[PDB]
Amino acid sequence: DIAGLTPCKESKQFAKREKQALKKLQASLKLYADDSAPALAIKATMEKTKKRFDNYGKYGLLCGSDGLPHLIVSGDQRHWGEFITPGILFLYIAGWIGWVGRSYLIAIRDEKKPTQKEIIIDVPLASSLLFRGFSWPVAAYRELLNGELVDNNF
Amino acid sequence: PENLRWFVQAELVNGRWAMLGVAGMLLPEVFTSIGIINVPKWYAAGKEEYFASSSTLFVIEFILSHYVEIRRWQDIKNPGSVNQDPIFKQYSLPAGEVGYPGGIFNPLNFAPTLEAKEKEIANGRLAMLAFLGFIIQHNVTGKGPFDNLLQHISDPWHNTIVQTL
Amino acid sequence: MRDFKTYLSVAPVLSTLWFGSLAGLLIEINRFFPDALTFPFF
Amino acid sequence: PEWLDGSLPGDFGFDPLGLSSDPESLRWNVQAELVHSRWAMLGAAGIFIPEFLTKLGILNTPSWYTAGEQEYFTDTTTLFIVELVFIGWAEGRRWADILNPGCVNLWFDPLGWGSASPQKLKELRTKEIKNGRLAMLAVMGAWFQHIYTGTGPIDNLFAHLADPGH
Amino acid sequence: PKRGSKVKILRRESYWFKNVGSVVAVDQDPKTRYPVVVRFAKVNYANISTNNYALDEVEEVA
Amino acid sequence: FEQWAKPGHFSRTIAKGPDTTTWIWNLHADAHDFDSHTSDLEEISRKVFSAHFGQLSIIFLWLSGMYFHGARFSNYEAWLNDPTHIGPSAQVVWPIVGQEILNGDVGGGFRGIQITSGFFQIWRASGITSELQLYCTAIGALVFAGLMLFAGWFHYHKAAPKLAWFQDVESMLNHHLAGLLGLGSLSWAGHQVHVSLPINQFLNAGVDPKEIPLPHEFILNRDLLAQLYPSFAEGATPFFTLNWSKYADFLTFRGGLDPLTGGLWLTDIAHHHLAIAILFLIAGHMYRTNWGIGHGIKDILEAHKGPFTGQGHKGLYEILTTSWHAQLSINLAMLGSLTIVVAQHMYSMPPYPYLATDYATQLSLFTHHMWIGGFLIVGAAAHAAIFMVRDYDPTTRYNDLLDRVLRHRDAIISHLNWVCIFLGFHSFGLYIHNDTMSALGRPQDMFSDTAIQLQPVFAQWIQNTHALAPGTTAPGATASTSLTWGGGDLVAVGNKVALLPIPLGTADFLVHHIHAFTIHVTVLILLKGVLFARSSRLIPDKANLGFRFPCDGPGRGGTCQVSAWDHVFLGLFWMYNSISVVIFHFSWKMQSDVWGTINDQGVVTHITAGNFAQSSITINGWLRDFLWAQASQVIQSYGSSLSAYGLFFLGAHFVWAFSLMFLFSGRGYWQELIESIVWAHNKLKVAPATQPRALSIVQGRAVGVTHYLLGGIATTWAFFLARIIAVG
Amino acid sequence: VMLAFGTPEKQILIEPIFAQWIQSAHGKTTYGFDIPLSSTNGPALNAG
Ligand SMILES: CC1=C(/C=C/C(C)=C/C=C/C(C)=C\C=C\C=C(C)\C=C\C=C(C)\C=C\C2=C(C)CCCC2(C)C)C(C)(C)CCC1
Ligand SMILES: CC1=C(/C=C/C(C)=C/C=C\C(C)=C/C=C/C=C(C)/C=C/C=C(C)/C=C/C2=C(C)CCCC2(C)C)C(C)(C)CCC1
Ligand SMILES: CC1=C(C/C=C(\C)CCC[C@H](C)CCC[C@@H](C)CCCC(C)C)C(=O)c2ccccc2C1=O
Incomplete structure (x- = not known):
């Protein structure tokens, strides 16, 4: 409800330009609609869509003039998450690749002699080398801030 | 294995706050009966009182909390600590943190500390499996039953995600 | 089999191979929850 | 600079190292293979053969309904969750016995010998009683359906052309 | 005493440099500036590497 | 055996106890190649047809798709029946x-x-018909790859195979002619007569669908084809001794084309493919072999001399026998136009039925089928180099015709260099004028048709004569050899047009003199850098850096781009500027001034205007009216099926773009860089050991070449496309 | 992508939330968002 941008439910545009945009693919009477492939340009799909119409709805995004999702989190109201509730994971999903990324490498001086010892990967991964990826920060993310860094290692 | 006697207490602390944590909503736990996602508070009460919201039960009872917890912290740090239950030892006889302050930089070892029975420890973690049952339902299926000879292992119904909420 | 181990690698198409036979899954998920638009927590 | 030369087997060219192949399988624990391949379908040596029977169920087929518990979508797809977690922990840590523990990197004895090795007729006891059974789950291999969307292997069946005609 | 140890490189000349260990060999032949023979396992824009050294340098730890 | 890698391969110093990233494109950038292999033919001849292998097994691996992904989901049937619309x-x-x-x-x-x-048009050409059919030919050709890829293993591997009887060169050069053309040409006639001819002649009206005379028929018993074009089909073929005249009926030089749908006659394609069929069967015995009949191999060439041009063209090479590289320009320049020849030919005078009228392939095809050609020749003689700097051994030559050039360099190249001003510089410097003379330049007086005219005119030429050519003069054939040329004797069909008298003039001795230009200063680039290449009059000694070899001196005050490898690194760009021109001129003739539609009162109506004539004189006219007059197609063109060409040249413009970044850029600048970042990994211990160095000079005159040169293609195929179809 | 593949409905256009604050306090009174100052009676826009 903030800055504009209305929650979709007053429908004005979006919902209609929608029930327009998608719905002249629908005028695909211009073929023969029964069973097809070769055609189904009409009947289905709209299932994902129109039979997801008033569905999408539904949490607002306060989709806005034009009548489309102006997608915003910034840390106000329910939204504090339309990208943050799915905004952290990414952080999470990446830099523990860094762990594998690190400990894969930080092995590539152990057992001794290295590099292409980088090309032949010694199938490097599946558990703790990754499956620590699971559990890094605020329990041990300060794998950073002691003996591994510094750095302090040799 | 994994690592060194780093946190014990941290997770111990956790397991301390744990059982009586899962004792907390363990009132909704229903002696026999009185539950749901909660609002109230032990019994009674009726002074003047413990209140809302230009008051909150929060900041009053939980500012002062701070010095009650920092004492431990700095107590850990500069040991510091009883004689000695929690950091660490006197009686009798838990799972040993075992080590002393340093390594070869770190590893002159690191973990020969297993051994025994069922024992003391255990229940500390029990309540976090409790939790990962007890949290998961309560917004997914917000009441806790158990029911034999009736329709356990039969069911009845269904209930998924998108309904709505 | 072992042991972490190591284990044994292979040559030039592993970082690659990763794209396909596993990474695809994505499009399954992206099918499974058709599109995303934004956050579905459970 | 080893060796390499040697490196190998240590040279080359041109032959018998031999260890040898390549071009098929297989050196280390090509026995995890062994130890996996017996069990996996010795297991199966008891799914379809019960089946390959039931068609013939002389006088009455089977019957069992429940006597357990009966309501709103009741019983068995729940399910493998319980059933094949139980037999889950079964599979796993019987056969971490390709060696096995970490050779890769209380007491001791029992039994007497070397996996009470053998005996040297019982090595033969396991033999192709172990293998010929996976010769015969090659019958499995070749569908293991016989219902080839095949109608067909009914009215039960199965077989049985011999081959009549007309 | 340190013949080819984990010893450093330290002069506004080099390529690798801070990069540590290795004095491999050291001569006894005086003239030059180049007594300190270094070989690691990391390389400049040659491939053979190892070029030589000495004097206003080894400002290092163990 | 053997094998396998692992480090080190062929670039001698490959393993190097590594040290740096940038080997992974020294190998990816050597790998096939030789001398950085060996000309030791007893292991290089036995690579080239090893090959040469897959490429086919790939071509097979190819074609076996283009019927499975034809005949697993037709438009073939669900259309065939009805060409047209x-x-x-x-x-x-x-x-x-x-x-x-x-x-x-x-x-x-x-x-x-x-x-x-085509394809639809390629397979409605023979006949086949039925998806379950050239799907019965999808399997015909896929294992059928297999065995041909089962030749890798055939010879070489268990069979280190033979240069002794590779070197020679007479059986094969005779047999290709006979042998494996000659299994063909005419043994497509047996097909093109019996299979092909009438399952078309009787397609040419009735025979709508399903009862489709599965080729199964028409062997052993005739009667039906007999019931069709006769020939008297007893068991005695006249023209065994000169009743030729009869078994004719259905193959007199018909020329023109099938006005009941363009193409042009299959009644006009056995006479073309049993004559040009057998020359290649006979004329594919003229050389030695064993049985005492044949010619010189080379013994012919030194046959003749001439005073200047001395020795003549004499004793014609002995690696020309041996191996590839030496040879390797000729099978390409040749094959070269042998894909610009078939091009300027195909559209030019239609094969398989359903073209002339079509578009979206009396164009489309036309191109690619000119890229591959341009591409091919305009990178054919980077094989003249290598060779000199390579496969050429000690001696064989001096007084050779060869050397007669290498001497006469500087003053052979040179006298092109000027044409390559005049021809162009000023003949392109010539739209320019008529821009300065349409903007500034008032129709009053300037270079267009009712302008720097040129009244009748330009003729015609000839062509035209090409239109008195069949009515006498080459007695007959039928209808004017190709409607495109001639007078006004004019056809088409399918409402829209087909081919007509496409008349030239101003707009025609213009443009042209650009392809007429270009393919001057696009060769000599080429010749300059093909002659000097090994001896260059200004680093004189080259074979001292390799084939590629970057530049050299910051000295002599600016020696770079010396290599032919880099004479080739821009050898191309222009082609693209030249092939990726010329296509253009084409697609605004075909159209605007050839394609049609129909209405009626004497009036053909083209995709666009008889514009062109005087609004493609001026340089501009090709953005006024060749862009923003077009592109509309693709500009809007989303939410649709033009929904790829609104999606390609996007990330085709970028990736014309993301060239210059690697191509305008520095190289030391970049290496200089990949520390800095380095500090992050390292100090924080991550960092490689394949020391991540920054892409090798040549290697990035090996991307803004590819990338530029991927870029402005798709783009124009993202583009030219979607124009055609709806205003197509 | 979408905008091409009939799908503008779904779309990643995340609308600026920040500059946003400015341009109102610095005066601008154009729709929504019940905060102070430009309130067209507000206590940074007062005292002055
Ligand atoms: C970050 C990220 C990403 C991104 C991506 C992107 C965004 C891209 C784009 C890019 C761009 C921005 C552009 C590009 C484009 C492409 C292209 C362009 C291709 C091509 C091609 C081809 C292969 C072709 C060929 C051809 C021929 C045959 C001839 C004629 C023409 C043509 C072209 C057709 C990814 C996903 C990776 C992953 C994750 C993250
Ligand atoms: C408090 C505050 C804030 C902040 C601000 C800022 C912006 C500041 C500055 C600050 C500082 C003072 C900073 C610094 C930082 C640092 C860093 C450093 C970051 C990061 C990082 C990184 C780079 C990482 C890495 C890693 C890790 C660590 C983990 C994962 C993996 C890896 C290894 C990759 C805010 C916003 C709320 C506002 C108010 C106040
Ligand atoms: C950018 C640039 C480089 C540096 C470019 C390099 C080193 C190419 C990068 C190679 C690839 C892309 C490695 C990057 C990582 C990838 C292998 C894959 C990771 C990314 C995802 C797909 C997972 C040059 O060397 C150069 C040389 C001469 C003139 C201009 C330039 C130039 O412009």
């Missing part, structure tokens, strides 16, 4: 994230992406 389609695509609309739904009961490049 309702047209091509060979791919329909899974329902992921909005793929869909990419498979249109516009083809006669078919959802699917529409298709440019």
